[PDB]
């Protein structure tokens, strides 16, 4: 279930050396492109289930049928996990400079 999440996480842990090696001026940009690979991961298959419904009752009190009902959940999940990826990138930077620390 954490296939792509931890996959790109470890790819970030790898790409740490290339990026803080400064291949080019695309440093935080290639991170965006790693995330961009995220949807082509959905290209073959990313089947799963949406979790339980509690506050969706409040949503029903607000209306706004199924479209945003699902958009909100998907976007919340995705934004959270990509914030995760982002300062996991930053963690990898922390360790790339742990290297210089011991250096």
């Amino acid at each position: 279930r954490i296939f792509r999440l931890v996959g790109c996480a470890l790819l970030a842990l790898g790409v740490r050396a290339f990026v803080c090696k400064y291949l080019s001026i695309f440093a935080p940009f290639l991170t965006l492109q790693l995330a961009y690979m995220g949807l082509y991961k959905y290209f073959p298959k990313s089947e799963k289930k949406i979790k339980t419904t509690v506050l969706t009752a409040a949503l029903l009190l607000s209306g706004i049928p199924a479209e945003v009902i699902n958009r909100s959940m998907d976007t919340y999940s995705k934004m959270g996990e990509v914030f995760t990826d982002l300062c996991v990138y930053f963690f990898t930077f922390i360790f790339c400079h742990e290297l210089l620390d011991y250096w």
Binding site: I2, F83, T84, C87, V88, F90, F91, I94, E98, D101
Partner: protein
């Protein structure tokens, strides 16, 4: 070396926080000794229950329906008693769960203001994200 040993001390902190978040079952074990007292009493009840159940099983319905129904009523009464005790147990468990969750989150606030006192913006949001995200996600690995 203390310079960045502090940027790792933040880790040490959140490490302690989350391992305590998992430690909370210790105070839950104190509550479990409480549950063991009331479990002694409910076990007395359960023994009574098995007794009267056998008694019932010794009785003919088609010719002594009176005793059978009177029993059945007494049985369901003891059952409601035990269910009430179970409700009390899970309710006090919810109580301890909530109060200890508040303890955890308020110690989260405590460590927040502490590290703030120790540094006194971008570094701060970094602090928060490292601790929360990274340690909670490895916590998700160990405890989804």
């Amino acid at each position: 070396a203390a310079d960045h040993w502090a940027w790792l001390l933040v880790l040490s902190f959140v490490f302690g926080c989350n391992v305590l978040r998992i430690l909370l079952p210790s105070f839950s074990s104190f509550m479990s000794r409480v549950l063991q007292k009331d479990a002694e009493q409910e076990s007395q009840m359960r023994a009574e229950i098995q007794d009267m159940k056998q008694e019932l099983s010794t009785v003919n319905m088609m010719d002594e329906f009176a005793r059978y129904a009177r029993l059945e009523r007494k049985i369901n009464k003891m059952t409601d008693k035990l269910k009430t005790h179970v409700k009390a147990r899970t309710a006090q468990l919810a109580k301890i769960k909530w109060v200890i969750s508040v303890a955890f989150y308020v110690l989260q606030a405590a460590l927040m203001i502490s590290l703030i006192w120790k540094y006194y913006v971008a570094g701060g949001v970094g602090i928060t994200c490292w601790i929360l995200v990274c340690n909670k996600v490895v916590a998700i690995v160990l405890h989804p």
